[PDB]
Amino acid sequence: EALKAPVVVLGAGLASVSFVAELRQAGYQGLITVVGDEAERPYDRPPLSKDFMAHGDAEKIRLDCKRAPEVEWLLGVTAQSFDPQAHTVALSDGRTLPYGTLVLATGAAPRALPTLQGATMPVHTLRTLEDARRIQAGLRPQSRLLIVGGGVIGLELAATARTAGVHVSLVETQPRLMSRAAPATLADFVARYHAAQGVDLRFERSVTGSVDGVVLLDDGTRIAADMVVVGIGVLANDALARAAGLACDDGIFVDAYGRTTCPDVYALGDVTRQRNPLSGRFERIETWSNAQNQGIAVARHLVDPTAPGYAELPWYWSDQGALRIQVAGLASGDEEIVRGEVSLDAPKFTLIELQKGRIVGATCVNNARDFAPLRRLLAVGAKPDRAALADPATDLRKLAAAV
Ligand SMILES: Cc1cc2nc3c(=O)[nH]c(=O)nc-3n(C[C@H](O)[C@H](O)[C@H](O)COP(=O)(O)OP(=O)(O)OC[C@H]3O[C@@H](n4cnc5c(N)ncnc54)[C@H](O)[C@@H]3O)c2cc1C
């Protein structure tokens, strides 16, 4: 009923690939056409601040489009507009695509820093393979890099650059790192780790401008750098949706079926503003797991309307040198339980966030084994014995089973 052929998807990132693979796997055999503005074989972004930044082989980061047979991928083509009455999409190459169902999977773009508009020194953001190549081409040993923003991507780049023998300074407007999506205990530990690896961290500082290779701060001081990478967050790529009259606010509003306010138009991944089931509030979720899992859920329900809506709880990971960080659910509740010691000597620990005895979030540092059972406990809103949660004798995989 809702799934009308032909299917057109705008964007060829993870959300798009995951969606079209699930359409095919679920048994939809109609036309699928995907429009991607990047002239690149679809690829995954997490490597760009990690192993790619370090080793430079793009053929290790391509998405597997095997589970998406009989898809026409229009790469290097921009969707300029769509007409939701005519059920058409206008492309940059002069062609028009008809659709029965239109899927907006256009992701998000790094926010520019207004105070570095008209900088006369290298200022980059890190989103694309082209961005990663341009940054890597300036990552010379004993270079000076300034990162603006203490989000996970800036910190992943900081670790990669330090490992490469690059001097790194980092300016954060907040009093802590990872203010978006991380428990304070984690953010404090992570700052201690980066400081110990030689990152020059500047907290509660904002950039006010730049002059001849030097960045100016709002404490009236200067940081000289060979290169600036700005990581102050992203803005949804929701321009086509806004122009066509869909409900958007830095992100296209969708329900759990991926429906926008425009009939026959859906949206998925980083472009969307959606319900976080743990907070009960709408948020733009900026994670790999959301892009994949939302794309799959929306495709499954299009093919099989008896399937449930998207229901997965949020989580991400970050690889920052010696720290393999995993974070699920909410950053805080009324209670944090710490398993293990929080120590720079062989870091290994777990945080559990509870709200009235109920697990609402969890963090693992170098403890992948405990993250899977904690996500299962989170998913059913488990209320375990807080003494047991704290006790390192406790086996979390066992608790997961018991419930
Ligand atoms: C450097 C980096 C590291 C990351 N590391 C992690 C990590 O460790 N863990 C984690 O959970 N998440 C991580 N993420 C986040 C994760 O990669 C994103 O959540 C994910 O890429 C979102 O996928 P998407 O398909 O919704 O959007 P995107 O990947 O942005 O894909 C959308 C595509 O649509 C294109 N597009 C936009 N407008 C148009 C148009 N008009 N016409 C055609 N094409 C268009 C875009 O240019 C883009 O190619 C990282 C992201 C980056 C950039």
Numbering used by the authors: 4 to 406
Article excerpt on this structure:
The long-wavelength beamline I23 at Diamond Light Source overcomes these limitations and extends the accessible wavelength range to λ = 5.9 Å. In this study, we report the determination of diverse protein structures by experimental phasing techniques carried out at long wavelengths on beamline I23 at Diamond Light Source using S, Ca, K, Cl, V, I, Cd, and P as anomalous scatterers. Native-SAD uses light atoms naturally occurring in proteins or bound to proteins. We demonstrate that long-wavelength native-SAD has become a very compelling technique, where a low multiplicity dataset from a single crystal can be sufficient for successful structure determination, making it a general vehicle of choice for experimental phasing.
The second method applies laser shaping of the crystal to remove all non-diffracting materials and define more regular path lengths through the crystals. Crystals of BphA4 complexed with FAD were shaped as spheres at SPring-8 (Japan) and collected at the phosphorus edge (λ = 5.76 Å) on beamline I23. At this wavelength, the anomalous signal from sulfur is negligible. Only the anomalous signal from the two phosphorus atoms of the FAD molecule was present to successfully phase BphA4, despite the low resolution of 3.7 Å (detector limited) and a low overall multiplicity of 12. Since the two phosphorus atoms are close to each other, they behave as a super-phosphorus with an anomalous peak height of 39.7 σ.
